[PDB]
Amino acid sequence: PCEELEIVWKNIKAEARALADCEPMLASFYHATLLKHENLGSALSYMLANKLASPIMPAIAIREVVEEAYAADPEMIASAACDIQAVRTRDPAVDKYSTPLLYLKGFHALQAYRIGHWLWNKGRRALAIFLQNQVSVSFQVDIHPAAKIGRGIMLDHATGIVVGETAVIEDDVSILQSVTLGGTGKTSGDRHPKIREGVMIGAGAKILGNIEVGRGAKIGAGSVVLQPVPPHTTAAGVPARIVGKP
Amino acid sequence: PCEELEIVWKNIKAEARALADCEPMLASFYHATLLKHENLGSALSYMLANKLASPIMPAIAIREVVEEAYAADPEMIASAACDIQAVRTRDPAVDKYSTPLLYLKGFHALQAYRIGHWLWNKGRRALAIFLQNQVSVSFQVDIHPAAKIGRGIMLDHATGIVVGETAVIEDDVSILQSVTLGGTGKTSGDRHPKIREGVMIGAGAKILGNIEVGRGAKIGAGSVVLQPVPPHTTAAGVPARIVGKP
Amino acid sequence: PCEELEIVWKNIKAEARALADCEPMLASFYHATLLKHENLGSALSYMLANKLASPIMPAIAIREVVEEAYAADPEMIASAACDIQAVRTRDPAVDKYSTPLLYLKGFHALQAYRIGHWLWNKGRRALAIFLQNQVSVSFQVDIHPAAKIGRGIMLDHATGIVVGETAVIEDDVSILQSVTLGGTGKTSGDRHPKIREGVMIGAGAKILGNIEVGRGAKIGAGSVVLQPVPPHTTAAGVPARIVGKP
Amino acid sequence: PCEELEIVWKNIKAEARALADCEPMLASFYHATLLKHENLGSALSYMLANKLASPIMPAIAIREVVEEAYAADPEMIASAACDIQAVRTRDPAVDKYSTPLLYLKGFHALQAYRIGHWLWNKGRRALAIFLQNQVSVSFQVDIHPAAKIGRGIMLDHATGIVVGETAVIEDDVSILQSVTLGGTGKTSGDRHPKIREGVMIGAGAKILGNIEVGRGAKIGAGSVVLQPVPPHTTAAGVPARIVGKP
Amino acid sequence: PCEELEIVWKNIKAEARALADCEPMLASFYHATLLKHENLGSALSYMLANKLASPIMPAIAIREVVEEAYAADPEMIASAACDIQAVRTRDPAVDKYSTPLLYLKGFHALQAYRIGHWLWNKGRRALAIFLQNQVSVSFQVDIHPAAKIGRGIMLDHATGIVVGETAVIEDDVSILQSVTLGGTGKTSGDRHPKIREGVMIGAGAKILGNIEVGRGAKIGAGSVVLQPVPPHTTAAGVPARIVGKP
Amino acid sequence: PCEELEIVWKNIKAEARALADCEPMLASFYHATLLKHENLGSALSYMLANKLASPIMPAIAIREVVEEAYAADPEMIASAACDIQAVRTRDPAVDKYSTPLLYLKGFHALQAYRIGHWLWNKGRRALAIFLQNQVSVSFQVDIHPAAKIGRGIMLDHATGIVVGETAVIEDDVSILQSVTLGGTGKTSGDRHPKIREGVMIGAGAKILGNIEVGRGAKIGAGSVVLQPVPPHTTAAGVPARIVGKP
Ligand SMILES: CCCCOC(=O)c1cc(O)c(O)c(O)c1
Ligand SMILES: CCCCOC(=O)c1cc(O)c(O)c(O)c1
Ligand SMILES: CCCCOC(=O)c1cc(O)c(O)c(O)c1
Ligand SMILES: CCCCOC(=O)c1cc(O)c(O)c(O)c1
Ligand SMILES: CCCCOC(=O)c1cc(O)c(O)c(O)c1
Ligand SMILES: CCCCOC(=O)c1cc(O)c(O)c(O)c1
C-alpha cells in the first residue's frame, strides 16, 4: 500500500529546501545529503556509502557497489520509499518523509540489507558479508544477507537487532531494538523464524527456531518465543504464551 | 548532593597531569582531551565534537553547536560534573574523576543529550534529532531530546539504551545496558515512563507506558514493567511484580 | 583441540588469494587486510588498529601498542587462531578461516580484549581502559580488561555483550548478542560470574553475581540467572531454573 | 600520432597485474587504482576524486562531477591516453603506461584541467574555479580552466606551473616545473601566450603576454620570453633571444 | 583606500546565496564555508582550520588558535577584507568578493601569516613556526611569521613564494608565484628586503638582501635584484638594472 | 663532521619536554611526534607516515615500509641526524635540534628520499617511485630515488626542488627553493649534475646536464648553469659565468 516513489522524493526535497532555510547550521548537510541529488536512489547510495565508510573501505568504493545494485534492481529504491512511509505512519515522533532517510539507523540498515541481499542472490557472497558486518558496526543491526525481508518495514531504534540466514520477514512488519530472529542452538538448515505480514515485535523479544509468527500478531517486549504464534494474537512472557489479541 | 564544578575540574587536571607522566603512549591523548583546556565545558565540547564527527558532519561544525548551548545554559556543565561524580561514587571499577569524561560512552551520550535537549527546547528540532541519531550510532544510546533527564545520572555500559520522547528521569538514577523506557503500542501523547529519583534499573529491563517508577525503587535485570512500581520497592520478572525492598 | 597457528594462516592466505580473483571489488581489501602480511599477528594488529582508529587516537598509534603486546606474549595470536576455528566449527553460516578474521566484530572484540588484558596485567590500566571503551563504541562489546577469558571462544553477533571486571570465561564458551555477565546491584569485590568450559549462552541472557555456570551447561535466551547452574544442565526463564540437559 | 585508448588500457592492466605480484605492499594500491576498474575513464575519475578530496569537498562528491564530464565528452579520456603516451615516449625515466596514470602529478593536473575546461565551457564557472584551485594546492599546478590545451602534453615534474586564462597550448608540447604562461602586468583581454605544437619549455621559463611561440621551438630554462619566438628556433636568456635551432 | 568590513561581508553573503542556487553541486560548500557564518572572522577561522588540518593537528585545534588571535586583534579581519578587495580590483579573472576567500591559496596563506605574526609577536613562536610550515605544505607559500606585511596585498597564484624573517612588505603590494624575498649569504641580522607600498613583483623574481624596493616600482619576472630599486622605476634582468618607468 | 645520533636525540627530547610546558596547545603534538618515541628512527617513521598519508595509501602502511628500510640500513637515521645539524648550524632562523625534525618540509623530503633510495637500490622501484611522487605532492620536492645524495644536506624552504635520476649531491650541500638539477633536453644515460661537497645553490638556480659543480662553489640565485663550475668559485647569471669566489 505504498505511495509513489517520485511523490515521496518530491516531498523529501520540498521539506529539505524549507528546513535548510530555518536551520543554517544544517543547510550544508541538507544540500549534500538530499538537495544535490536528482533522485532517491542517488541520495540513498551517497548516504550509505558515507555512513559505512571506514579505513577498511572508502565511501567512493561503497558507492559504486550500491549504484550497481540499484541500476540492476531499481525496485529496491521503491522498497526504500515504502520503508520511509512505514516509519512516518507508525512512529508518532516522525512527521516528515525526510526524517527516516536522513537520521534513522534502522532505515539505513534496512536499505543496506537490500544491497547485501541483491549481492548474495548474485553469488557475490564476500561483498554481501562485508556489508552485513559493516552495517553491524555502523548501525548496530546484524541481518544476514540471505534473509528474505519485504517492504514497509520499520526497524524502530534498531540497536542490537539480529536476523538469521533463513529468516523471512513479510511486508509491513515493525521490529524494535534488541530483537533476535535466531536459532534454537547449534542447529542447521532452515532454522530461523518466519515473521508474517503486519507483525509487531517488542523490544528485546527473542524469536527462536523455524517457527511461524502469524499475520497481524503482536510479540511482547522481552518475550522468548519458542513455538508458533497464531495470526492476530498477542504472545508474551518467558517462554511466550498467548495473552490476548491486538 | 553534588560538589563544585571548579573543584572536579581541578581534580581532573591533577589526575591527567600525573597520568600523562606514567603512560607516555597516552600523553598526547591526555593533553588534547583535557590539559590544554581551560575549563570542563571546553573539554566537553571538544570531546563530543571529536567522537560524534563523521563524513556527514565534521568535528569543527559540531563543536560550534555544543559551545553555543554551553554559553547559553552553563548549568549543563554543572550537570556533567554531577554525572561524573555519580559514576565515581557508584561504579566500583571507577576511582578517578577523569575516567567518565575520558572513556565512558554512557557519560558522553548523556552530555550529548543535554545539548540536544537545549536545542529541542529552543525549537531547533532538526539539529536535536540529528544529534540524537548520531549519538545512537556513535555511543549506541538513543535518547529522544524531548525526554526530561536530571543530573547525577549513571548510564552504566550503556549499549542499547533507548529512552522515549515523553520520558522523565529524575536525579540520581542508575540505568544499565539495554534498558528501554518505551511505549506499549502504537501509542500517542504522554506514553513513556516516569523514573523518579534514586531508581536503579538493571540490564535489559523494559519499562513500558506512562507509568511511574517510584523513588528509590530497584528494577530487576530482564524485567518487563507494565504497571507502576511503588517507591523503595524491588520489581522484577516478566511481567514485573513486587519481590522485596532495597 | 586447536589446529596449529601456521596452518590456520596458510589456509587464510589461500582462501584470500582465491577470493581476490573471484571478487575484483574486494581485491584491495584482501591484499591490505591479509595478503601483504607475513603472519597472523601482523594482520591482527593492522586490523585492530584500523578498526579502532578515531580522531582521538589514530591507527598508527594503536598498532604500536598491539604489536608490543603480541611481541611480549605471542600466545595471544595462538588464542586468536583457536577463536577463528571456534566460529568456523560452531557457526553454520561460516565455512572459511578468513571470515572471522575479516568480518566478525565479536572475534575482533575478543582479540582487542586480549591486548587490554595483557596491558591491565602489566599495570598499564589507562591504556587497557582506553581500549576497552573504544572496543565498546566500535564493536559494541564491553569487556572489562581484568576479566579472565580463555580461547576457542565465540562471540556470535556480539552486540550489547557486557562482561564485568571479575568474570571468568573458560575455553570453548559460546556467547550471543546482548549477554551480560554482571553484578547483583551496588556490589564490590568478587562480584561477576564464573563461566566454565563449553558453556553456551543464549541471546539476551543476564548472568548476575559471583555464581558459577558449570561445565557444558546451556543458558536460555532471555534468562536471568541468579543462582549457580550445575554442569551439563539447561537453565532458562526469569529467574532461571533447570529445564533439562544438552 | 596516438595509440588507441583500449590498447593503452589493456597494457595498463597487464602491467598492474604483473606489478601487483612482484610488490605485495602495493597490491592493494594497484587493485584500488587500476585493476577493479572496467575502463580508463573509471580509473581516472576515481584517482582524481581521491587525490583532490579534502575536508571542504569529499572524494565521493568530486567523482560525480568528473564522471558527468567524461560521460558528456568521452574524448577527454582519449586525450588522457595521448598524454600517458607523451610521458612514456619523452621521459627516459618512464617505461610503463601505468606510471603517468599512477604517480605523476603533472599528468593528474592535466586531466583535472580537462574536467575544469569542460565545466567552464558549459558555463559552470564556480565548479571549474573550485577544481582549478584545488589542483593548485594538491598538485601545485595552476591552470586557468579557460586555457585551451591540446593532447599529447607532458607536464614534467610540474610544480609551480602557472597557465593564464587566455593561453593556448597545442598538441605535443612539453612543459617543465616552474613555467609561467602569463601576462606583462596590469593587463586585460587576450593577454597570455600561444604555445604551438611540439614546443619544449625548460624549467622556470616565464613566457609573458599575448605572444606566439612557434611550432617546434625550444625555450631555455630560466628564460623570460617577451617577444614572439619563430618556429623551430631555440630562444633563451633574460630577456630571451634566438640562440640556435633544435 | 579600503572599504568597510561589514560591507564586503554582506556582499560575500549575497554572492554566495545566489551562487548556491545556480550550482547545486557547490551549495553544501557555499553553506559550510560562508552562509552559516555570522561574520568574516568566523568564516576565515573555519576555512583556515579546514585547509590546514592534518593527521598531526586537526581542524578543531587549529580553529581555537585562529579564533583567539582574531578576538585579541580584530584588525586582522579588516586586513583580510582589504586583501580580498586587492585581488578583486587587480586580478582581471576575479570579479566577486567571495572568490579570494573561497579559492585562492595566496589569500589563505596571507591570512594564515597574520595569525602566525600575531602569535610570534606574543612570544608564541612554536605555534607560529608550526603554522608557517603547515602553510608551506598546504598552500606552498613560506612566509616567516616575523616578516612585517601590510594590507591590500595580492599573492597571485602564489606557489613557491618565500619571504624571510626580517622582510617588510608595505600596503598594496602585488607578488606573483615563485618570488623569493631572501638573503645573500650565509647572512645574519637584518638581511631580507624592504618592499615599499604599491610595488609589483613578477613571477620568479629573487630579491636578495637588506635592500629597498622603492614605492610604486615594478620588478620584472625572473629578475635577480641585488641592489636597491628607486621608487616608480622598473627593474629587470639577471642581475636587475633600471629599464624604465611604470 | 656530525654530532652523535644519540646525543641529538637526547637534545631533541629535552627541548620538546620544555616546549610542551610553555605551549599547552602544542603539548599533544610534541608528545605524539617526539616524546612517546624511544629513538629518532621511530619518530622519523611516524612523522613521514603521517605527513605522506593519503586516501591512496594510509599512514599505517607507509610506516611499515619506512621501519623496514631503517631496520635494514640504520645509517639512514645517522644521516637524518647530520641533516638536522646542517640546518641548525646554517639557518640563522633555527636554534633547536627539534625544529627541522618537527617542521621543515625540506628535511622531511630529504629523509623520505633516503627511504626511496634504499628501496630503489633493492630493486623495489614501484614503491620508491610511489614515495618520490607522494613526496612531490606533500612536500613539493621531487627527487628521483636513484639520485645519490649525501648527508649534512639542507633543503632550505625547498618548494619546487627537482633532482634528476643520475644526479649526485655530496655531503654538506645547501640547496634553496626552486632549484633544478636537471637535463639539457630530450637526453639519456648520465645526464644530470654532479654537485660536490659544501656547494650552496641559490633560489631558482637551474643546473643542467652531466656537469660538475666543484667543491665549495656558490651558485647564484636564478642562474642557469650549463658548463662546469670550478671548485671554490661563485657562478651566476643566465647563462652562468664566474663572478668571484665565496
Ligand atoms: C508481558 C506482556 C508484555 C507486553 O509487551 C507489549 O505489549 C509490547 C509493547 C510494545 O511497545 C510493543 O511495541 C510490542 O510489540 C509489545
Ligand atoms: C529476578 C530478580 C531481579 C534480578 O535483577 C536484579 O536484582 C538486579 C537489579 C539491578 O537494578 C541491578 O543493577 C542488578 O545488577 C541486578
Ligand atoms: C526455555 C526458554 C528459552 C530457551 O532458549 C534456548 O533454548 C536457547 C539457548 C541457547 O544457548 C541458544 O543459543 C539458543 O539459540 C536458544
Ligand atoms: C641558453 C641558456 C639556457 C638553455 O636551457 C636549455 O637549453 C634547456 C631547454 C629545455 O627546453 C630543456 O628541457 C632543458 O632541459 C634545457
Ligand atoms: C625583462 C623585462 C621584465 C619583464 O617582466 C615584467 O615586465 C613583468 C613584471 C611584473 O611585475 C609582472 O607582473 C609581469 O606580469 C611582467
Ligand atoms: C648575479 C649574482 C646573483 C648572486 O646570487 C647570490 O649571491 C646568492 C644568494 C643567496 O642567498 C644564496 O644562498 C646563494 O647561493 C647565492
Author numbering:
A (entry chain B), B (entry chain C), C (entry chain A), D (entry chain A), E (entry chain C), F (entry chain B): 2 to 247
Paper text:
Serine O-acetyltransferase (CysE) is an enzyme in many bacteria that catalyzes the first step in l-cysteine biosynthesis by transferring an acetyl group from acetyl coenzyme A (acetyl-CoA) to l-serine to form O-acetylserine. In this study, we used recombinant CysE cloned from Salmonella Typhimurium (StCysE).
Because of the poor water solubility of OGA, we could not crystalize StCysE in a complex with OGA. We did, however, successfully obtain a co-crystal of StCysE complexed with BGA and hence could determine its crystal structure. BGA binds to the hydrophobic pocket of StCysE where it is very close to the binding site of CoA. The ketone group of BGA interacts with the side chain of Lys-219. The ester O atom of BGA interacts with the main chain N atom of Ala-222. The hydrophobic alkyl chain of BGA is surrounded by hydrophobic residues of the enzyme: Leu-209, Ala-222, Leu-227, and Ala-237. The binding site of acetyl-CoA overlaps with the BGA-binding site. Thus, binding of BGA to the enzyme may compete with binding of acetyl-CoA, which would result in inhibition of StCysE activity. It should be note that all these amino acids that make up the binding site of butyl gallate are conserved between StCysE and EcCysE.
